Amino acid sequence: VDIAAFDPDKDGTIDLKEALAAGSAAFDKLDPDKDGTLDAKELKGRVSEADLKKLDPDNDGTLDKKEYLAAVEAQFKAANPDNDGTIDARELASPAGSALVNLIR
Ligand SMILES: [Nd+3]
Ligand SMILES: [Nd+3]
Ligand SMILES: [Nd+3]
Ligand SMILES: [Nd+3]
C-alpha cells in the first residue's frame, strides 16, 4: 500500500487520476455481487457505517461508483493540504493519507 503501488508513471507521487484509477479498481473488487453499489457490509474495515452516510448524498444506503470516486477525490484533497495536485510519501503516511489508502487499496 506504498506510493509505488499507486504510481504507474514513476514520478514518485500519486496524482488525482492515479487515485481515481485505483479507487475504481477497488470499487470493482469490493462489489462481488455485481449490483453496482457498495453497502456498509461490503465496506467494513475501510469505511465505517457513520462515514458512509456522509458520502451518500441520496441516502439510499449505498455508494455507486460515482459517489465512491467522489469520496476518493475528497479524501485525496484532505490528505493533500498543500493543494499541489500530488500526494507524496509523507502525505500518504499522514492520518488523512491512511484514510485515502483504505479507499484505494
Ligand atoms: Nd504519478
Ligand atoms: Nd453490492
Ligand atoms: Nd447512493
Ligand atoms: Nd502534496
Residue numbers in the entry: 29 to 133
Copy out sentences from the published article reporting this entry, exactly as the authors wrote them:
The discovery of the founding member of the LanM family of lanthanide-binding proteins demonstrated that nature has evolved macromolecules surpassing the selectivity of synthetic f-element chelators. The natural lanthanide-binding protein lanmodulin (LanM)4,5 is a sustainable alternative to conventional solvent-extraction-based separation. Second, adjacent EF hands in LanMs are separated by 12–13 residues—rather than the typical ≈25 residues in CaII-responsive EF-hand proteins—resulting in an unusual three-helix bundle architecture with the metal-binding sites on the periphery.
Unusually among RE chelators, Mex-LanM favours the larger and more abundant light REs (LREs), especially LaIII–SmIII, over heavy REs (HREs). The metal-binding sites of Mex-LanM differ substantially from those of Hans-LanM. The increased coordination numbers in Mex-LanM relative to calmodulin result from bidentate coordination of D5 and an additional solvent ligand. The observation of the two solvent molecules per metal site and the hydrogen bond to the D9 residue validates recent spectroscopic studies.
